[PDB]
């Protein structure tokens, strides 16, 4: 139900678009850079980075964070550096692994007895180790045991008020699995409640948060009118207005001001997907679905208007012109012709939709692995990273695009996580209604596990697949740059985030409204 509709978006007029605030922000960045210089103790430097990242400010102080981490990496092999502080050792491990520096799981072996496992009673060190454990790689048995020990400890905390909340939040979403800006409002309030806070950092955080909101509202005004012009919400009564919801995804994929064009193409692509998804899952017959798939494969407006059912013509032509204008924009901007690539990615999505439609017609229930092979495409993972790269990169690198098109492993496993996480949003009523089988039902069918156990096993699979993704991310030799890989991971992070605050089983909050439309006072 679209409350935040076109007229609502056009009517907004945030004060923080103004030039005055933009001047105070520059003044504050300067003073913060100076205060950073006076932080010399390593643990204080690590906590500074952690604070910058969770306030949403880190993209403003990138060289300063790079410096701190480079210098801590130089020194962390010194003789008496390992200070046997579980919190400090875990914080350093997280941050260094987050930014691609090698650190061994062996930095934790001192906190662990071979017989009785991990020994620690300090909640602060347990919480930090728990966050660090999500940077594990495949086969790091210390990191796996660390997760087993910390998650067990944190579950028992909820059988002091801030301690319980921290444990609850880390159990439902570790820092590695959340994009920076999504936690920004919560952490800003934690931060200002601190005695030792830096007052200029906090004020910069509130100001940049409100500025970001204003920037997004302007984009939404423009995206909104474009969506109204296509009138899809009018010809098809099922084509609902999911514009704000789509923009929320696009902002989780790429929040920074410079990615405005990326957010625009992502938002419109996702809105079109929800319309197409409806046609393939619900309203179209198989023969119609077969014609639409072919029309996309041919990429031929004349054929499409000749052969498509009436109710599909506008949906097709809206996609067709949107993608062709997308290709035009990139041709004009940087002389790069990516039409074959983008239309290939859309075809792949649509072909995967068809497969699912044929399974449903035959009432076939595939085994999980066969479901996921197709479901990693149909969840739009491969399409979304291709869109994000083509719309978010100047200059587009041919070898990098070619790597994305070769179906690389980082995209394979990220999209599987995405698909599993989305499928966990299914409710028990539909699990027991039983018409269309997804991850949970395929797993139940294949193992005889109950729904409750199936969900738990599927959640564990996600944690294990993130171990592979962590390897591909630290691989300095892939064609994908770090910033390209962040688009992909932010997509996965956004599915983890929306499982908690979305439509389905993981949930009056409306975090979307809170992220986009509700400033932080002062």
From Swiss-Prot:
Matching SUPFAM superfamilies: Terpenoid cyclases/Protein prenyltransferases, Terpenoid synthases
Cofactor: Mg(2+); Mn(2+)
Regulation: Inhibited by 2-fluorogeranyl diphosphate (FGPP) and 2-fluoroneryl diphosphate (FNPP).
GO annotation (BP), single: diterpenoid biosynthetic process
Localization per record: Plastid, Chloroplast
Residue positions of motif DDXXD motif: 277-281
Residue positions binding Mn(2+) 3: 422
Annotated family: Belongs to the terpene synthase family.
Function: Catalyzes the conversion of geranyl diphosphate to (+)-(4R)-limonene. Produces exclusively the (+)-enantiomer. Can use neryl diphosphate as substrate. Has no activity with farnesyl diphosphate.
Protein known as: (R)-limonene synthase 1, chloroplastic
Species of provenance: Citrus sinensis
């Amino acid at each position: 139900p679209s409350i935040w509709d076109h007229d609502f978006l056009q009517s907004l007029n945030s004060n923080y678009t103004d030039e005055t605030y933009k001047r105070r922000a520059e003044e504050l960045k300067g003073k913060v850079k100076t205060a950073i210089k006076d932080v010399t103790e390593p643990l204080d430097q690590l906590e500074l980075i952690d604070n910058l990242q969770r306030l949403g400010l880190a993209y403003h102080f990138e060289p300063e964070i790079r410096n701190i981490l480079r210098n801590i990496h130089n020194h962390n092999k010194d003789y008496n550096w390992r200070k046997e502080n579980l919190y400090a050792t875990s914080l350093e491990f997280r941050l260094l692994r987050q930014h691609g520096y090698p650190v061994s799981q062996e930095v934790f072996s001192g906190f662990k007895d071979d017989k009785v496992g991990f020994i620690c009673d300090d909640f602060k060190g347990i919480l930090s180790l728990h966050e660090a454990s999500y940077y594990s790689l495949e086969g790091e048995s210390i990191m796996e045991e660390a997760w087993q020990f910390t998650s067990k400890h944190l579950k028992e905390m909820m059988i002091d008020v801030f301690v319980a909340e921290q444990a609850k939040r880390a159990l439902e979403l570790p820092l590695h699995w959340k994009a920076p800006m999504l936690e920004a409002r919560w952490f800003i309030h934690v931060y200002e409640k601190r005695e030792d806070k830096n007052h200029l950092l906090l004020e910069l955080a509130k100001l940049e948060f409100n500025t970001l909101q204003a920037i997004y509202q302007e984009e939404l005004k423009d995206i909104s009118g474009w969506w109204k012009d296509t009138g899809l919400g009018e010809k098809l009564s099922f084509a609902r207005n999911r514009l704000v919801a789509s923009f929320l995804w696009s902002m989780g994929i790429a929040f920074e001001p410079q990615f405005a064009y990326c957010r625009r193409v992502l938002t419109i692509s996702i809105a079109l997907i929800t319309v197409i998804d409806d046609i393939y899952d619900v309203y179209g017959t198989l023969d119609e679905l077969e014609i639409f798939t072919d029309a996309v494969a041919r990429w031929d407006i004349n054929y499409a208007l000749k052969h498509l059912p009436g109710y599909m013509k506008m949906c097709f032509l809206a996609l067709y012109n949107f993608v062709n204008e997308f290709a035009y924009y990139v041709l004009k901007q940087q002389d790069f012709d990516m039409l074959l690539s983008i239309k290939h990615a859309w075809l792949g999505l649509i072909q995967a939709y068809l497969v699912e439609a044929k399974w449903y017609h035959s009432k076939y229930t595939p085994k999980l692995e066969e479901y996921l092979e197709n479901g990693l495409v149909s969840i739009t993972g491969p399409l979304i990273i291709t869109i994000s790269y083509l719309s978010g990169t100047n200059p587009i690198i041919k070898k990098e695009l070619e790597f994305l098109e070769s179906n690389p492993d980082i995209v394979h496993w990220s999209s599987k996580i995405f698909r599993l996480q989305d499928d966990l949003g299914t409710s028990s009523d539909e699990i027991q209604r039983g018409d269309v089988p997804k991850s949970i039902q395929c797993y139940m069918h294949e193992t005889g596990a109950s729904e409750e156990v199936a969900r738990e096993h599927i959640k564990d699979m996600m944690r294990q697949m993130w171990k592979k993704v962590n390897a591909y991310t630290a691989d300095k030799d892939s064609p994908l740059t770090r910033t390209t890989a962040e688009f992909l991971l932010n997509l996965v992070r956004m599915s983890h985030f929306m499982y908690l605050h979305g439509d389905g089983h993981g949930v009056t909050i409306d975090v979307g409204f809170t992220l986009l439309f509700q400033p932080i006072p002062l």
